[PDB]
Each structure stands twice: as structure tokens, then as C-alpha cells.
Point group: D2
Chain length 97, copies 4
Amino acid sequence: RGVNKVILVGNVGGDPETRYMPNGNAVTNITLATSESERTEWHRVVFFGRLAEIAGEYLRKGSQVYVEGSLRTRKWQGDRYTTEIVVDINGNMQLLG
Amino acid sequence: RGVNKVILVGNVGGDPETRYMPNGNAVTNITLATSESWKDKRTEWHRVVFFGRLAEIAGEYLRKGSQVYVEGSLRTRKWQGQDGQDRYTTEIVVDINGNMQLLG
Amino acid sequence: RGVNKVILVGNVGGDPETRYMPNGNAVTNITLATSEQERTEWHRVVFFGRLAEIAGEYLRKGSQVYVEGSLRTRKWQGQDGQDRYTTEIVVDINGNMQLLG
Amino acid sequence: RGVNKVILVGNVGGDPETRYMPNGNAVTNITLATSESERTEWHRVVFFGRLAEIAGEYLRKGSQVYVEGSLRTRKWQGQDRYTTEIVVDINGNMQLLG
DNA sequence: TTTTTTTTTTT
DNA sequence: TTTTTTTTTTTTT
């Protein structure tokens, strides 16, 4: 019994990087900036499945986007950890502007 | 500008730590485990930080294995490890702009 | 391009009502109380699909529950002939339900 | 002990209406359209304090907006009529988009 | 088409 | 000047 939800509205940092799995499923990375206080926070968002395809085709540097997903910390050595907002079938993405 | 919102429901990993800093502020850190339950024929760990009033309420009531609702913001803190290399810790900051609700 | 999301943590006011349709799709109705002196807001939450059966199985009066859904306002003509409006929280495959406690 | 949270991103139906209470504080109301792919949903949003002024000043028919608030059902009144509104106050948030 | 639930505190 | 006069589309927990 848990909940793990993240909601972001911000600007795409650089043009998305789309990659494809051995099974051919797209996965797309962006960085995403939100501002508070004025302070900029950078988020690593990774899209999977159909939304990865929509991300890489429609987002550019500067895009304002809404993003809904869940937090997962990815373990990767050479021991380091990247916390990412994972956007898949249980989440959402909407291009604004 | 922008929106930076995190909503978690999970169990507190360990007894909370409350620390008061020279400015008189409570800051309490916990870890939080959120679990998703699969099916075919699991666990995520979050670092949460309370400041201010909710820091006081967190330190008082939360214990090992308390169920809690947490609403905060994402914050990633850069730091150089002892090996010289930069590393990154992403936390969930819960302050006056957030919200906490003990559950049960 | 739109977002329509509701998130509630609250207490069920009474036992669920799960209604099955000829198709075998279930619909489950509850009301749900959230409190901010103390001030209680009552929500009408309706579950569709699998989550209708899961809510029907697991929610009871007094249950503390998290729900994530979407807002839906239903228009209807009252016996007085006048337009009325019921705004509900719709929980279906795009939503979530987690029994708390 | 509860949570009562609403998050909408959609488009304003018409120009905001803003009024002033005795104490001088603004209150802005709008309707907001959210569309699901085809089928539109209309929400009644009410802003209080600071955000009411901001909403009053920069929102107009068709403005794309992010809104964060709480649900509140207000019984009014010649019998009773109940409206459920999205109340955006100090605890909420609003972001103009585009 | 209208009753309730629950109760460990300057977004 | 109204009781929601309508908005606006860069597409299966």
C-alpha cells in the first residue's frame, strides 16, 4: 500500500534524447527546470512506451510541459545513484504553450 | 514559476532525527519506503526533509513504520565525494508550502 | 491538452454500494469526508472497472483511504423541473485507490 | 485529518470576474475547461487573496492555466442549490501558461 | 437525488 | 447584466 506521484510543470532543458530498447520500445530522456522562491531546480525525466515517442517527437529545448510520474532512484556504478521522474503508462505528459 | 510537487504515501524507514540549527529551526530527516504491488504469472526509498512547523510535528509523532502522507518539493543537492567526484542527492522537501499527515 | 486530477485522503462515510451491470462491469459508490473550527467536506467518489470491485471489496464505513481520480459534474433535472449539478470524483483505470491503515 | 487537492490544466471559458470584499480583498472566479480525448469538463474555480488579483489581471477567454486548490461544496439559498468549486487560496497555486 | 466519516495540530 | 452565455487541440495504479 503506497503512493508515489510527482507532478512537474516546467521548461525542457535540452532537446530530448530518444533511445530504443532491444525489444524496440522507445525511452526518452529530458532535463526539466522548475523555479521557486528565484532558484532553478533541474529534474531528470525519463519517458517510456508511447509517451517516449510523443516526447521525442514534440518536445524541444525551451518547451513548457506538464509531467506526471513517479520517483525512482537508479543504481549505477562507474556506486552512484540517479533519482528520476519515470513517466510511463501510469503517468501523463502535456505540452503547453 | 513552474510546479514542483511530490506526493508520497509510505512507511517511515527508521526512527526520525530532529536537529535544531543555530537559527532555532527544526529540521528533521527521515527515509520513506513506498511500495508498488505487481502481478503476473517493488520498494522505493525516499529521503524526506521537514523544516519549520512540520519539522516539529514530524519529529514528535513519526516512528519506525509509521504510515504517512507527505507532500513536498523535489530538491537535488550537489556535493563532491571524498573520491573527488561530484555526486547528487535528491530529496523531498516538506515545509510550510507542503503538508504531512500521519496515517492510522 | 488538459489535466483533471483530484487527490483525497479521507474517511468513508458509509459502506460501499457496488452495482453490477449486465456487461459485468461494476460501479461502486461511496462518500468521503476530508477535514481541515474543524471543517468536514463530503465528496461523492465513484469507482469504475476493476477499482469498482476492489473498492467494493475493501472499503467500509470509517475506512481511511487515498483516492486519485478526475472531476466530473453531472447535470440533471430535479422534480421541481430545475437544473441541478452533482460534481463527483471519478476513479477509473487512470486513477488510484489505496486503503490506508 | 485529510487531504483535499485538485490540479487542473486547461483553458478559461470567459474573462474573469473579480469582486471586492468589505476588507478590500479580491475574489476572482472563472470557469475552466479540461478536455479528455472530444469530451470537455467545466470547472468552477474561485481564487482568493493575492492570486485573485493576479488571476483577475492576466487571465482572459482562452488563456491556458495551471490551477491547484481544494474542492469546496457551497450550499446556497427558493430552495437549496449546491455548487462544488475549486477554491484556490494561500494553500493553492496558479500558473499562467503559454 | 442528500447522512455519514474520523479525531495525537503568512502553502 | 451572468447562474454557469463558454474554452481550446502540436494526436490502455
